């Protein structure tokens, strides 16, 4: 009898039952997609799309649904926080129901193909035994893949006969589903260029249909046929796993490093935006531009959108979560209620002090109030350590510009110490941990979780490709 | 019919192997899952 790990090998030589099992897996995946979409919509909180977006609510499938056009919902709300007067057939609930219906239909088809596995289509007309013409099957499927890729690139992404895709400004302040005109120049290969996606899909679909026609009209060479064991299904499995973990690594890297296909407003900020001070640099540039116009510090900082300040916060950094810190970010630092404002620390002498922000690596980091020149003018002693430049001694005061605490100054050493400890994380924000009993420990973004899962799966599928290439190349010795 | 079908065989040693693996993973990962 087949061992527990070899049991599925029973369906190697039955193309009809192979169709059945593949259909069952596709049905399971579609059902998972639908059920996950329903669950996320059930637990979604669209009241605050600024300070509580989907990525703060730990939504995995919702970003992908909304990336390609699904913004409205049957619940009377859109993803931008407005009211969806006309949701239409295609919504989050509509897409989930469509996926569930597809899962059921594919399950029925799997049952049918399991029962009637002896179809004459799989029998070789001349040899009389179940054989799959793998090169021509590949030609057909590559032709279909290229046709669908061209359709997606020329009708969906471009908006010719579709909604477009999610495109946003570099800082992810105002982003919407828009038509994306293709970019055929070198900038088309700029990963953060949305037109690159449309141009890519058009060109790749054209080449895919061309290659499908080629593989249909051209038979494999005998030397290649025997070298790659093209008559065997397991070489196809190994090569498919190869392509699959290549795609897994590429997509994980794209998600982790960010691109036009992984917008900030959907999957949350990137780690390297916090590391390089992307949002901090933008906010400082805006504040300096406002000040150059003659506006006051409070007025200049009030112009900064709360969304930008929220992005400039290490809690939103995907690389601060834990492997077993389960749940959404809202269960970590807590649901964000509002923005307190930028905290300017001024010492007794008059110098302005900037808190040394927490590098992504450190979980606990010393609270250092630096100068313009970078000298450590103050800090907080390590717990009950000897104090020489402590907040109590130097007596630095914190003044808040913009946000809830606009135009408020605190000189109390305890309050200034607390606000410095909060400001080392970036922009100071108010969180209500009572809503979800948040633990106070940061948690990873859907960006980070997607990257973790897909890199782990890519390594595992590299091992699977190794194993199946071994099995197909060494079929002679694996079974005498 | 089912020309190619084989009932899965799982002897006693493989049973104990699987049970030990599951219980070892459980004791190892419970301290983290509970957190």
């Amino acid at each position: 009898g087949l061992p527990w790990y070899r049991v599925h090998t029973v369906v190697i030589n039955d193309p009809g039952r192979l169709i059945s099992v593949h259909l069952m897996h596709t049905a399971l995946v579609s059902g998972w997609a639908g059920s996950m979409a329903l669950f996320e919509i059930s637990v979604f909180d669209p009241s605050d799309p600024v300070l509580n977006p989907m990525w703060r609510q730990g939504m995995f499938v919702l970003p992908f649904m909304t990336r390609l056009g699904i913004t409205q919902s049957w619940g009377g709300w859109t993803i931008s926080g407005e009211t969806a007067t006309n949701p239409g057939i295609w919504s989050y609930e509509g897409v989930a129901a469509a996926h569930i219906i597809l899962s059921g239909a594919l399950f029925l088809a799997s049952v049918w193909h399991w029962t009637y596995w002896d179809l004459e289509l799989f029998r070789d007309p001349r040899t009389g035994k179940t054989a799959l013409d793998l090169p021509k099957i590949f030609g057909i499927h590559l032709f279909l893949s290229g046709l669908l890729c061209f359709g997606f690139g020329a009708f969906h992404v471009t908006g010719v006969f579709g909604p477009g895709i999610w495109v946003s400004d570099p800082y992810g302040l105002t982003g919407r589903v828009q038509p994306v005109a293709p970019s055929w120049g070198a900038d088309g290969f700029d990963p953060y260029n949305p037109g690159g996606i449309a141009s890519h899909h058009i060109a790749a679909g054209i080449l895919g249909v061309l290659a499908g026609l080629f593989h249909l009209c051209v038979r494999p060479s005998i030397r290649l046929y025997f070298g790659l064991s093209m008559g065997s299904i397991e070489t196809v499995l190994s090569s498919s796993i190869a392509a699959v973990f290549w795609a897994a690594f590429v997509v994980a890297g794209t998600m982790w490093y960010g691109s036009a296909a992984t917008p900030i407003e959907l999957f949350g900020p990137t780690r390297y935006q916090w590391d390089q001070g992307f949002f901090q640099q933008e906010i400082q540039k805006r504040v300096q531009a406002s000040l150059a116009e003659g506006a006051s510090l409070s007025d200049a900082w009030s112009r900064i959108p709360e969304k930008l300040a929220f992005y400039d916060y290490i809690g939103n950094n995907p690389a601060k979560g834990g492997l077993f810190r389960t749940g959404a970010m809202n269960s970590g630092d807590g649901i964000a209620v509002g923005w307190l404002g930028h905290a300017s620390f001024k010492d007794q002498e008059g110098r302005e002090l900037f808190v040394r922000r927490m590098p992504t690596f450190f979980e606990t980091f010393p609270v250092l109030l630096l100068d313009k020149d970078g000298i450590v003018r103050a800090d907080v002693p390590f717990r009950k350590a000897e104090s020489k430049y402590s907040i109590e001694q130097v007596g630095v005061s914190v003044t808040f510009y913009g946000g809830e605490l606009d135009g408020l100054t605190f000189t109390d050493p305890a309050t200034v110490k607390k606000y410095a400890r909060k400001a080392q994380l970036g922009e100071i924000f108010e969180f209500d941990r009572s809503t979800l009993q948040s633990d106070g420990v940061f948690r990873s973004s859907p960006r980070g979780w997607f990257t973790f899962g897909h890199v782990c799966f890519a390594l595992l599928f590299f091992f699977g490709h190794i194993w199946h290439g071994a099995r197909t190349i060494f079929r002679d010795v694996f079974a005498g | 019919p089912n020309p190619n079908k084989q009932v899965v065989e799982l002897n006693r040693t493989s049973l104990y192997w699987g049970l030990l693996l599951i219980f070892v993973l459980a004791v190892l990962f419970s301290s983290y899952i509970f957190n």
Partner: peptide, 27 residues
């Protein structure tokens, strides 16, 4: 942690039951 307790219970239950039913099928 209700989630953790449920996950641990499920992880103890379903694979043990799978292995046991396999053994019953063929010892």
């Amino acid at each position: 942690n209700i989630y953790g307790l449920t996950a641990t219970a499920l992880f103890i239950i379903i694979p043990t039951s799978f292995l046991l039913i396999l053994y019953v099928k063929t010892a």
